[PDB]
Every structure is written in structure tokens, then in C-alpha cells.
């Protein structure tokens, strides 16, 4: 009879880096999706597998809320079957994704004058990530044939890189906060209606 804590997600004072994306599980609560689609402060709102309007009349066993920050040009990668540094090495959606992708411009929050170097992204990785996989290893990336065993040098660089958000960047380089809602239907009693 109590509403789901969607405020703790969309309104979090701090967001996680895309490589270490945050995930909150939502269950046993009455989900009021009405205001979310009505919200004009959202720049991106694309649902896959379900209709945006036709959603309040649905019950799900689990609802996962993932949140992170990426570039504006990289928002198009938060979709099924996309490729890129974020979709391959940071956050990957399955081809049969059932959920919605929500994003809005956060240049007024996550950018500092001297550059906000708190938001990071995994730049190099040997293989693409599996769907809903999370990789937070800081092991030095070996690009060449010869290894390094911990030597930040040629063909051996740190796998993580900073965005360095400044308020004067173009919309493509500005920070965008993303919230991905996954709707899970298991053979268990349903908890989110």
C-alpha cells in the first residue's frame, strides 16, 4: 500500500560513475509511474518491451533501478543492441530488454569550473561486457604483446579515465544522469504493481 522509493533514485544528490553503476532493487511497493512520463524535465525517455502510457496496469516480481552519469553523445548507447565504449565496456543492455531508459541534462550539477574529475568510465577492456554486468577492476590494461605487471607506460595504460566535466562543454560532452528501470517477471509472487 506504500509507494516505491523512486525518489531515492531520480533525486539522489550524488550519482555513480558509469563503470561502477549503482543498482537498487525495488519490491513490495505500489509503483506510481504516472508522474515519470508526465515529467518534462527528462530529455530521454525510451521504453523497450512495454508501452510508456500502458504501464501502471502491470505487476512485476522485481524492478531494478540503475543510475549513473555519461556524456550526452553516449546516451544513445543506453539501448538494446548498441555499440560503443559505454555499451561494450561499461553498461550493456540485453537484446531482449524489458524496461525503460530515462536521462536528463545535469550540467548544472555534475560539472565544475576546473573540471569535475569524479565521474569515470572504463576506457579499455579485452572483451565486451555481458548484459547487466559490472566491472570495477583497476588492473592495468595490457595493450601490447609484452605485459607490464603494473607499469603505466606505452601499451600499458590505466583502464579507467575521467570525464572532467566543465560547464562550458557542448551538449555532447556535458554530463547526463541516466536511470534504467528493468522489469523482471519470475515464477515468484509478484511484488511491484
Amino acid at each position, epitope marked *: 500500500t506504500n509507494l516505491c522509493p523512486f525518489g531515492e533514485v531520480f533525486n539522489a544528490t550524488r550519482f555513480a560513475s558509469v563503470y561502477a553503476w549503482n543498482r537498487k532493487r525495488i519490491s513490495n511497493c505500489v509503483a506510481d509511474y504516472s508522474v515519470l512520463y508526465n515529467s518534462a524535465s527528462f530529455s530521454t525517455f525510451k521504453c523497450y518491451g512495454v508501452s510508456p502510457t500502458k504501464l501502471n496496469d502491470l505487476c512485476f516480481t522485481n524492478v531494478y533501478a540503475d543510475s549513473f552519469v555519461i556524456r550526452g553523445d553516449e546516451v544513445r548507447q543506453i539501448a538494446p543492441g548498441q555499440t560503443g565504449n559505454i555499451a561494450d565496456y561499461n553498461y550493456k543492455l540485453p537484446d531482449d530488454f524489458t524496461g525503460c531508459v530515462i536521462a536528463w541534462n545535469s550540467n548544472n550539477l555534475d560539472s565544475k569550473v576546473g573540471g569535475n574529475y569524479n565521474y569515470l568510465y572504463r*576506457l*579499455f577492456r579485452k572483451s565486451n561486457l555481458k548484459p547487466f554486468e559490472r566491472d570495477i577492476s583497476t588492473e592495468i590494461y595490457q595493450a601490447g604483446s609484452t605485459p607490464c605487471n603494473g607499469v603505466k607506460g606505452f601499451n600499458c595504460y590505466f583502464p579507467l*579515465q575521467s570525464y572532467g566535466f566543465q560547464p562550458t562543454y557542448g551538449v555532447g560532452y556535458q554530463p547526463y544522469r541516466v536511470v534504467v528501470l528493468s522489469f523482471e517477471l519470475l515464477h515468484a509472487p509478484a511484488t511491484v504493481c
Partner: antibody
Framework: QVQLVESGPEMKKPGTSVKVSCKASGFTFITSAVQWVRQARGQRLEWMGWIAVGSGNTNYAQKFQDRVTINRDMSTSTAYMELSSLRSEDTAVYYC????????????????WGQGTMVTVSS | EIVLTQSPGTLSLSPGERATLSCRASQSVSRNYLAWYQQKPGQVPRLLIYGASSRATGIPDRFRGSGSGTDFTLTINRLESEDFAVYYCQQYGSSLFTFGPGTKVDIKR
């Protein structure tokens, strides 16, 4: 066609700056690294600096720390070298080199070289 | 800075002989990252050997590299006429890279 193409000839008065282009083709620019080497007429190769394309991290020799800044623009897949406070001693041919790489692995050496950029400084 | 030196300054050999060039590093290479380049007059350098002993693509098998720490060797088994040029070595494993002074291989007379 793994290629690396540079700017045209430059002729700058002493004390000004020159920015030499170095555009890549045929390979994934994001993951390799670009070094800059100059060579005076009939002299040896002189290493200036290098930049990692993905991170943008730079390293510069002692002689060129004061006046050289290497950057890159991965949207145009071009790395640049800027040399400020030019003088007659800077008159040389400037080369850029990079390893050929794909999405995940690189060559263990600088096998891709540019055609050269002639910079002439004289009052 | 790692100092790089080559010997000899000029190598006088006849076409057909075996050439042997030397490259010396002031300290141990950071990661066996020693490259050999060939430069004909008025041309761009051409990578011959990368990473100590690994031939680059398109280089004939007569070019070979060796070494490990501070003393490295470039060996041409049978010197062809197209091989008479200047040869530079470069270490590139420790932040700052450095070149050698070069070694000119000319026709013996």
C-alpha cells in the same frame, strides 16, 4: 590503407607558434598513441613527446617542456603538436608516429609514420 | 633521461657482407622496448625491428635484432644495395623516449 597524414609546409616568423596536424586512417585511433619526432636538415632523429589517444596523457622531453603541447581530437581522429616561441633552431621536419591497433590490441611499436611537415623559422 | 648511443658512426662494408650495428642504453630498458629504424636520405623513417627481437611487417628476413638490457644488436646477414642508409635505435618503455645518434652504412671503397 593504414595511413597517417600531416599538415603542409609551415613558414612562421620567429617568436610565433605553429600547430602541425596529424590525421589517422585505416585503424582505430582511440586505443593507440602518437609520438612526435623532429629532424633538422641532415641531423639525427630528436624525440619530442608522445600522447596516449584514449586518456590524453602526455609526456615531453626536457628540451621541449617549455614550448610544446601535444593534444588530440578523437572526433576528427587527429592529433596536434603546438610549438610556441619559435626560433631559427626549430627549423626542421616534424614527424608523427603511432602503432596500428584494432578495438583491443596494439602493435608493439610505432609502425605507422607520417610524411613529414617542414617548418621554417626566419626573420 | 635514458641516454642512447650507437656504434660505429659510419660502417664501411661491401654489398654482400654481414653488417652488425650496436645500440647502448645508459640504463636497463624499461621493458625490452627497443626499436630499429632505417632512413634513406630525404625520406621518412621506416620501422625495421620493434621490441628487441621482433621483425616489423614487410621487412625482409635478413634483418634481425637481439639484446636484452643495455647492449642491443642489429644484424643484416647479407647486405643488399637497398640497405645502405642510416639506422637509428630508440627505447620507448619509460615515459620519455630517446633516440641514438645513428649509424651510416655506406659502400666500401
Amino acid at each position: 590503407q593504414v595511413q597517417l597524414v600531416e599538415s603542409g609546409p609551415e613558414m612562421k616568423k620567429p617568436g610565433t607558434s605553429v600547430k602541425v596536424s596529424c590525421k589517422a586512417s585505416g585503424f582505430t585511433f582511440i586505443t593507440s598513441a602518437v609520438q612526435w619526432v623532429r629532424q633538422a636538415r641532415g641531423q639525427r632523429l630528436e624525440w619530442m613527446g608522445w600522447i596516449a589517444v584514449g586518456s590524453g596523457n602526455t609526456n615531453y622531453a626536457q628540451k621541449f617542456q617549455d614550448r610544446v603541447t601535444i593534444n588530440r581530437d578523437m572526433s576528427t581522429s587527429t592529433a596536434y603538436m603546438e610549438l610556441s616561441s619559435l626560433r631559427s633552431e626549430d627549423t626542421a621536419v616534424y614527424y608523427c608516429a603511432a602503432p596500428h591497433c584494432n578495438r583491443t590490441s596494439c602493435h608493439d611499436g610505432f609502425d605507422i609514420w607520417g610524411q613529414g611537415t617542414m617548418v621554417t623559422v626566419s626573420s | 633521461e635514458i641516454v642512447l648511443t650507437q656504434s660505429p658512426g659510419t660502417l664501411s662494408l661491401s654489398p654482400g657482407e654481414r653488417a652488425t650495428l650496436s645500440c647502448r642504453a645508459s640504463q636497463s630498458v624499461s621493458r625490452n622496448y627497443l626499436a630499429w629504424y632505417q632512413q634513406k636520405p630525404g625520406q621518412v623513417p621506416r620501422l625495421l625491428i620493434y621490441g628487441a627481437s621482433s621483425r616489423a611487417t614487410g621487412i625482409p628476413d635478413r634483418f634481425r635484432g637481439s639484446g636484452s638490457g643495455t647492449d642491443f644488436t642489429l644484424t643484416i646477414n647479407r647486405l643488399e644495395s637497398e640497405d645502405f642508409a642510416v639506422y637509428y635505435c630508440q627505447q620507448y618503455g619509460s615515459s620519455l623516449f630517446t633516440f641514438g645518434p645513428g649509424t651510416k652504412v655506406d659502400i666500401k671503397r
